[PDB]
Symmetry: C3
Subunit: 455 residues, 3 copies
């Protein structure tokens, strides 16, 4: 629980260290079943308010089944087709459509509400009966309506059927706007207790059960619900849960801000910005890099990421933070003439790139302005700092305990000649810039020697 | 229909064929109404627990009307153009605001729950009345709260009122967290029974009707629900359904991956990627091109694409898949020295671009690693392949049945000279690069020929 | 409430004026509390169908509390949107902090608390399950015989307990941070009262009260703490520090030459599209559509995704070649047709053999576009069609002004024209043109010195 940050004045960037990894490398799929009733629109003569209420709820139930069947055949079209995040769960969904595969699971859950079932294609899956509308309707609602004249229901039955039928009605809702594939997995799909018991039974280490059971909200966001089948008066859908094959390896976050020359005026400055910003995690002797901000979820020390949305880099990518001119790795930069002030709120600090006439401050709740940034790239930690202002933009600062280190260094943009500086580099590196520098240096050579005997 | 795939080894790209178009070409707008009672706060002195329950629900109802009164408005509006998706629906919504227009649909719906109404701007909309709280509240509920006597209602009345009031509360909730515009359109806005009837009354062909009725989730995802008015005891919101004016025309999806040289040097390679990846659909003698995958939704072999984010290309854009050096169409490519390994999952295969020191493999569930990729661009079909692994990332291949064709050919990056190669073209083409090869080729010769006569 | 729009034929761009600003510049943080009961799992034996229903509902209550014990806690800059709210959420986890709010709300439902760091925060109690369960429910479950409850008590408990369950559900699928803020988090009456009690101007209160739907979309709810029979979450409302200043929106479309030989054309595009609003003598610029919401002529934008520009930036709309500001453009050779639906019109850039059309629903085609960049107002036009795409135009009411002028791409020699600038400016392309003219002159001089 020790977060530390280093600000590199040399490159206008900061790295937040001390995080712990949880990287999704596998999937666990489970079959979730709901038992339905095979009851027809009741032919019974009666018109009390209570039986009116029961018939209304029955028509809700009957329509939910029908509109779930329209989701089936429209293999369901939404299983055959697109997917890599879902292929594992889609694989189990297709198998349930084989001859008697439903009856396999139906038998295992006849006597118990949770059982392990071996499937015909060679997968072993935990299967759960989360709701039984078959026995409630057949034993408490069939005797009332499967006659010529309907006997009155108790008010207790009217209330409790509404409660039971509600989960099915909600599942049909989520499954008829999401086309049968949803993420995060809702509580109507799998409650907190059901997901906790399912984690408890998974073929994983006891420490993985610790991590998953403590971060259920994150597990929800990295899980999928895949709709499978209605048949044999059963409702089956597949829940696809993450398997974290990488745990407790170091992770760090890179924050980058533009670095520009200052002492010149107007539109005559050279700028460069480190590009490889995002999360990094040590993974199997290499570095997993997650460039898009959404894919990694943070809870206290832990960074939860999905390896499917990652690039794999050598360990030497970190040498960019220690020495951007190191030989071993070609550190990535971008360049431009854009001389614009901005700020980046780091894990426990703030980078300020103040340029031009912009007024850039950092302030405290009580003392007011406690720093006025000069032109150039600077940094301030969150110790006694609450907000940062750049122009007309007030940023609040993350208030999170940790140690912050200011690594003084010469801004590398000072080392470059502005006349031969490539200033349109969308995605370049240190070496690529040096190659273009020499080529323009060589053109200057070749042209100058063409004027020796002439001039 | 049978999905087929071709991989072109020369250009590091693949084309998935065999799909059927379903293109959003227009909009269909309908008005949904709920009849309300303008009941004032009860003022019945009685204190029975059932009267409290009725009173508490009336408060939930009366607050929903107030909250809908606060939402009385709709909205305000390969690099593409810019549209305004709900401009059609908002246009109908603005007309309903005008004085006397709400009274027009009140009269037309006096004797039926569905009618076509003429509004002031020639706007002629099918109108639906889907819930009548006015009858229930004014007849069943008003008398037992009207007096100061407070006729205590049966417990059925407490429950019955909650069920009727539920949909209005849920419609208000959806509008509240969406500024009056919701998408996808939920079954609270428009139930499956209601939506299917609306599809049956659109000005479309019978084949178009079946397509929507069997793709209700897609239709809902591409529809909008727009809060318009609450006045004259009427709540009215506009529903904006999609119009699929182009249907059953052939579509194909283009996948592209970087194509670089395999030289063993620290970044001394030239890369090249086709930039035209996306969905292509035949459309009225042209090709509609959708470069962003999130405008197109696939269901088996059906592609639902929104034309608002499309480009209109000549039929000859497909020639880039036969001969990229063809004269008729000028294929768009990008260049760089950015040389790194990635994998692209196609419809029934996987493209792998292995570069440098990365472990790029394809493996089978039971047989193990069945292919290790050499440096360069390669393809593997889904036949007998389950997973593709690049670095620390494991991709899953579609197990969808189909036939894929490997088209051998010399990689075209080899054709180009790595010294006169324009190697940072973000959005270029074959001609624009030959444009710049000829320039740098001619300039170098001139300076060499101009160095000759200096004797 | 007078929207107007001007089309500049010279630069293929349009400006929509007349809008009024509502800029989110800061945050207001408030604490919302639900008082809970330490009620423990009933261990009276009962079989009555109503006893089961009460027991089942206490189960949903108990599981909700357990679930909540786990839910605890142009290129722009980068912010931390919920930093202000999370900062207050952190303070609640200090000891005694829960009790100060518990003490300040012992006898009332709405009180100010100065937390351990001395910040005045408004706190509220929106639901009191502690009194209901302990008084109404505990006697009928806290014995052996399990007193039969009336059906009315079963229904009330479901109603009271429902809001707790639905708050739990929202936090559970969102990792304890929700946006927009739902009516379960904060009902309409509670939000309006909260607005009325904030330390803000009357104009700010009026602006927020008329735009509760937008305020919800710009607000956050942060799960903070549960302990000592109390549940607390932080609600982070927007501060509109800048109000009623004039805004305008800039629409741009590619401007190209119209030579009939394909591939022989040079193109130009203003890259400064987005919202502009006057702000403290400078101009706040919002280049993204997502960061700005519009209701009638009022524009709600979030300054976290804005650049601060000199007020001279507006000269680019009157004179793109003005000396006081370097207007940003981009160049290309791509001769492609597109359309831009402006506030009360549509810009059509029609190139090649493309079909470009403006139509009325009952009269049919009313304007047919030829090669170049043109503009049609929404007065009398319902749709604009470019190629295989049909756009409906906005039907907001306002007056368009068509400003005639020579397209500026007609002032550039295509040979020396730099047609690759992904980001550039008017000055920058004049540099590269001065340079290419200078080099080609130097080359010519060198063959004279050797001739």
């Amino acid at each position: 629980q020790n977060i530390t940050e280093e600000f590199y004045q040399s490159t206008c960037s900061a790295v937040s260290k001390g995080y712990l990894s949880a990287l999704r490398t596998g999937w666990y799929t489970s079959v979730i079943t709901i038992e339905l009733s095979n009851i027809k629109e009741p032919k019974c003569n009666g018109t009390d308010a209570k039986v009116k209420l029961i018939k209304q709820e029955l028509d809700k139930y009957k329509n939910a089944v029908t509109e779930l069947q329209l989701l089936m055949q429209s293999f369901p079209p939404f299983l055959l087709g697109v997917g890599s995040a879902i292929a594992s769960g889609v694989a189990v969904s297709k198998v349930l459509h084989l001859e008697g595969e439903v009856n396999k699971i139906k038998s295992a859950l006849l006597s118990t509400n949770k059982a392990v079932v071996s499937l015909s294609n060679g997968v072993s899956v935990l299967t759960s009966k989360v709701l039984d509308l078959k026995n409630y309707i057949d034993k408490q609602l069939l005797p009332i309506v499967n006659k010529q004249s309907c006997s009155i229901p108790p008010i207790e039955t009217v209330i409790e059927f509404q409660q039971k039928n509600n989960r099915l009605l909600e599942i049909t809702r989520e499954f008829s706007v999401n086309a049968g594939v949803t993420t995060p997995v809702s509580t109507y799909m799998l409650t907190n207790s059901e997901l906790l018991s399912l984690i408890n039974d998974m073929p994983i280490t006891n420490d993985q059960k610790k991590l998953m059971s403590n971060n259920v909200p994150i597990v929800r966001q990295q899980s999928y619900s895949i709709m499978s089948i209605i048949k044999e008066e059963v409702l089956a859908y597949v829940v696809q849960l993450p398997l974290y094959g990488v745990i407790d390896t170091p992770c760090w976050k890179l924050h980058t801000s533009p670095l520009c020359t200052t002492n010149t005026k107007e539109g005559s400055n050279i700028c460069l910005t480190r590009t490889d910003r995002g999360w990094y995690c040590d993974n199997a002797g290499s570095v997993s890099f997650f460039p898009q901000a959404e894919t990694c979820k943070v809870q206290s020390n832990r960074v939860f990421c999905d390896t499917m949305n990652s690039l794999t880099l050598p360990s030497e990518v970190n040498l960019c933070n220690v020495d951007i001119f190191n030989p071993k790795y070609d550190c990535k930069i971008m360049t431009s003439k854009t001389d614009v002030s901005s700020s980046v709120i780091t894990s426990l600090g703030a980078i300020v790139s103040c340029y031009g006439k912009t007024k850039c401050t950092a302030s405290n709740k009580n003392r007011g302005i406690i720093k006025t940034f000069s032109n150039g790239c600077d940094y301030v930690s969150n110790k006694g700092v609450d907000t940062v202002s750049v122009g007309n933009t007030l940023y609040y600062v993350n208030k999170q305990e940790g140690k912050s280190l200011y690594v003084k260094g010469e801004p590398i943009i000072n080392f470059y000649d502005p006349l031969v500086f490539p200033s349109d580099e969308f995605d370049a590196s240190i070496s690529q810039v040096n190659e273009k520098i020499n080529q323009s240096l060589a053109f200057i050579r070749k042209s100058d020697e063409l004027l020796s005997a002439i001039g």
